[PDB]
């Protein structure tokens, strides 16, 4: 597995620019904010509802250990 | 170049090349706008060559 022996490819062209020809920060807080609002809207409904179930079990669990004592 | 004489070449130029107008139409002058260099790269991938 070295570079000129990996795959076979035809008819694709690549254009690139030098690092000294470029700006470091073209857009940082004018695309950085709406792009993470797209990536957050895609993940939230898969990741958050299991942790809302740990919260409702922690809150009920540490409320039947207090009232077991002192009537 | 070759076997030619300059005096004869000048006379043939006056006879055949003097109907060209010598001052520009509405006398607008050319001026070369310069051309910049950019470090960069282009890659054409074709494995059947």
From TrEMBL, chain A:
It comes from the Eukaryota. InterPro entries: Cyt_bc1_su8, Cyt_bc1_su8_sf. Keywords: Electron transport, Membrane, Mitochondrion, Mitochondrion inner membrane, Respiratory chain, Transmembrane, Transmembrane helix, Transport. It is a single-pass membrane protein. The chain crosses the membrane at residues 43-61. One of its GO terms (biological process) is midbrain development. SUPFAM superfamilies: Ubiquinone-binding protein QP-C of cytochrome bc1 complex (Ubiquinol-cytochrome c reductase) (SSF81508). It is found in: Mitochondrion inner membrane. One of its GO terms (cellular component) is mitochondrial inner membrane. Belongs to the UQCRQ/QCR8 family. Component of the ubiquinol-cytochrome c oxidoreductase (cytochrome b-c1 complex, complex III, CIII), a multisubunit enzyme composed of 11 subunits. The complex is composed of 3 respiratory subunits cytochrome b, cytochrome c1 and Rieske protein UQCRFS1, 2 core protein subunits UQCRC1/QCR1 and UQCRC2/QCR2, and 6 low-molecular weight protein subunits UQCRH/QCR6, UQCRB/QCR7, UQCRQ/QCR8, UQCR10/QCR9, UQCR11/QCR10 and subunit 9, the cleavage product of Rieske protein UQCRFS1. Component of the ubiquinol-cytochrome c oxidoreductase, a multisubunit transmembrane complex that is part of the mitochondrial electron transport chain which drives oxidative phosphorylation. The complex plays an important role in the uptake of multiple carbon sources present in different host niches. This is Cytochrome b-c1 complex subunit 8. It comes from Sus scrofa (Pig).
Automatic annotation (TrEMBL), chain B:
It is found in: Mitochondrion inner membrane. Coiled coil: none annotated. It comes from the Eukaryota. Component of the ubiquinol-cytochrome c oxidoreductase (cytochrome b-c1 complex, complex III, CIII), a multisubunit enzyme composed of 11 subunits. The complex is composed of 3 respiratory subunits cytochrome b, cytochrome c1 and Rieske protein UQCRFS1, 2 core protein subunits UQCRC1/QCR1 and UQCRC2/QCR2, and 6 low-molecular weight protein subunits UQCRH/QCR6, UQCRB/QCR7, UQCRQ/QCR8, UQCR10/QCR9, UQCR11/QCR10 and subunit 9, the cleavage product of Rieske protein UQCRFS1. Belongs to the peptidase M16 family. UQCRC1/QCR1 subfamily. This is Cytochrome b-c1 complex subunit 1, mitochondrial. It comes from Sus scrofa.
């Amino acid at each position: 597995r070295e570079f000129g022996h990996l795959t076979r490819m035809r008819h694709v062209i690549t254009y690139s620019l030098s690092p000294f020809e470029q700006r470091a920060f073209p857009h940082y807080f004018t695309k950085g904010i709406p792009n993470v609002l797209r990536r957050t809207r895609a993940c939230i409904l898969r990741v958050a509802p299991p942790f809302v179930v740990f919260y409702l079990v922690y809150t009920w669990g540490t409320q039947e250990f207090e009232k077991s004592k002192r009537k | 170049a070759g076997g030619v004489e300059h005096r004869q070449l000048l006379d043939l130029a006056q006879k055949h090349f003097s109907s060209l107008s010598g001052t520009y139409v509405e006398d607008a002058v050319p001026a070369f706008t310069p051309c910049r260099f950019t470090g960069s790269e282009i890659r054409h991938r074709d494995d059947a060559l």
